[PDB]
Design a protein around this ligand. Structure first.
Ligand code: 4SP
Lengths: 297, 258
């Protein structure tokens, strides 16, 4: 079954399973193989795999990792994906000295927003965007990967799993326990990633849910009824929260120009209803001169 | 959050056509009949109530069962095995906290073993080519609900009840698409409760009119009128609960005046 693939090396461990780099011996194609340990007398095919496969087969887009095949065994389940060269996290670390040039930041953001707009349009929430799940190739592309936490949503949404999104990239409506969250949770995440590409550091690196909230409040201001109607009735909202003043965005990501700060602020709006959609973001003036620089790997 | 509501509705309209079961498959099934399918479907309603499963889960299970039986011949003593695996897959796809495999073995009062349930899971996945994110009557209703003015909880619950009834009888509901059944159920519910009709705004959204909904609607009206007498009664029982405003005991209209 896996006779045509030669494993080259282990790549990492994401939401579920294990990812290896492999090469197809007949075609030459390098692939990433996600290997799923299955069994009988346990729970069978894991839900994460069922959702990932069914949704990825639907999602064909240049900024979404491509699922090429599913080799489904009685023992193991293998997902064969196109191979990407590295993750954004590793890229930022390597650009430690240089920094990522604005044209590259802009192209990567524009591309991710196309990827995301495509998911949302197809009723899919990603729910785990972070630099380890954003993969880059040697042609200037960046793609969404690790759809193991994804799910299909309904219109209007009902309550879905609360335990979602890595903490540093987690939206305030999730931290405050809202019974409904939607697409705006993925935008909040990409907004933090936009900030991080520029400053080369996490915007909100909290180590607990309350630390995370307080770091967001110190940056964006403690939200009240005026900024966000309903916040004070939210389940984990506390009237004892300190009341920090909002900071000017020029101070939040100093190298960013006015259009950039204007986009960032819209992607980090507290009220998930007013937070900009990926689709609408593509038409933001920040992208007026966007190109696709090929990165210095 | 409407920025994608029409993209999504469009895409589901495309996918219901790709995920549609074959309309005449029961005539190609040697050993099972529409009536054995009803019993299975009625038992799944009970299993969903026992485990407090989402309605969406049940609608997806049924879709899985009808698509599998469209290509796979199954003996009567195995049909519940197919149904158990389908409910397992649906719960995994849709539920925050799905029942464990052992709960599914138990619900069949040990007619089958875990190993058979898990092997059937694998075969359903293979036959459906892992294509589990199917549109359902429920997903369409929930969007149509947004067009009410004002929202009426009874109209919503009654529309859900009617759509659920449609899952039970393959003759005639397999010939109709989810979006169309949802149209008929919403109109029938809205009419029963409020006197009002399929709104103009849903004509603009769906392209469906009362004339195009007619055939499904006459079928659904009869089903609604005969529900207290049908051999399967679990949906009628479920919709007596306060969670669904007791809608199953509203009186159906005697005529629709179309
Ligand atoms: N660390 S790194 O920079 O050395 C490097 C990273 C990722 C890859 N390549 C690659 N990885 C995948 O999942 C890898 C996986 C690891 C765990 C976190 C989620 C993502 C893919 N899934 C489809 N295609 C994939 N391609 C190559 C090098």
């Amino acid at each position: 079954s896996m006779e045509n693939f030669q494993k080259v090396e282990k790549i990492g461990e994401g939401t579920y399973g294990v990812v290896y780099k492999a090469r197809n011996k007949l075609t030459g194609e390098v692939v990433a193989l996600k290997k799923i340990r299955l069994d009988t007398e346990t729970e069978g095919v894991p839900s994460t795999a069922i959702r990932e496969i069914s949704l990825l087969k639907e999602l064909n887009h240049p900024n979404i990792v491509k699922l090429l095949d599913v080799i489904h065994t009685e023992n193991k389940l293998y997902l064969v994906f196109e191979f990407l060269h590295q993750d954004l996290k590793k890229f930022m670390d390597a650009s430690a000295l240089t920094g990522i040039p604005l044209p590259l930041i802009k192209s990567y953001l524009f591309q991710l927003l196309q990827g995301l707009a495509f998911c949302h349009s197809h009723r899919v929430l990603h729910r785990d965007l972070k630099p380890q799940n954003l993969l880059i190739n040697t042609e200037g592309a960046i793609k969404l990967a690790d759809f193991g936490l994804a799910r299909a949503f309904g219109v209007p949404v009902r309550t879905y799993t609360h335990e979602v999104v890595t903490l540093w990239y987690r939206a305030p409506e999730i931290l405050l326990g809202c019974k409904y969250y939607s697409t705006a949770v993925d935008i909040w995440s990409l907004g933090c990633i936009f900030a991080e590409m520029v400053t080369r550091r996490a915007l909100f690196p909290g180590d607990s849910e309350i630390d995370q909230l307080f770091r967001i409040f110190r940056t964006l201001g403690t939200p009240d009824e005026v900024v966000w109607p309903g916040v004070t009735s939210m389940p984990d909202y506390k009237p004892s929260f300190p009341k920090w003043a909002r900071q000017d965005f020029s101070k939040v990501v100093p190298p960013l120009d006015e259009d950039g700060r204007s986009l960032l602020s819209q992607m980090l709006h507290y009220d998930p209803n007013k937070r900009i959609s990926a689709k609408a973001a593509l038409a933001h003036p920040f992208f007026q001169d966007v190109t696709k620089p090929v990165p210095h790997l | 959050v409407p920025d994608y509501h029409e993209d999504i509705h469009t895409y589901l309209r495309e996918m219901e056509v790709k995920c549609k079961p074959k309309v005449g498959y029961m005539k190609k099934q040697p050993d099972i009949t529409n009536s054995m399918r009803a019993i299975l479907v009625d038992w799944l309603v009970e299993v969903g109530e026992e485990y407090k499963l989402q309605n969406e889960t049940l609608h997806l299970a049924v879709n899985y069962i009808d698509r599998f039986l469209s290509s796979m011949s199954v003996l009567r003593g195995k049909l519940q095995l197919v149904g158990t695996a389908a409910m397992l897959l649906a719960s995994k796809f849709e539920e925050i906290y799905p029942p464990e495999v052992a709960e599914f073995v138990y619900i069949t009062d040990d007619t089958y073993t875990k190993k058979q349930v898990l092997r059937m899971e694998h075969l359903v996945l293979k036959v459906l080519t892992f294509d589990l994110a199917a549109p359902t009557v429920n997903q369409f209703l929930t969007q149509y609900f947004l067009h009410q003015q004002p929202a009426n909880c009874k109209v919503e619950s009654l529309a859900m009840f009617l759509g659920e009834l449609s899952l039970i009888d393959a003759d005639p509901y397999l010939k109709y698409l989810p979006s169309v059944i949802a149209g008929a159920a919403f109109h029938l519910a809205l009419y029963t409760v409020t006197g009002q009709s399929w709104p103009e705004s849903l004509i603009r959204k769906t392209g469906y009119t009362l004339e195009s909904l007619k055939p499904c609607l006459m079928d659904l009206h009869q089903t609604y009128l005969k529900a207290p007498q049908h051999a399967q009664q679990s949906i009628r029982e479920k919709y007596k609960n306060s969670k669904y405003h007791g809608v199953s005991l509203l009186n159906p209209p005697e005529t629709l005046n179309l």
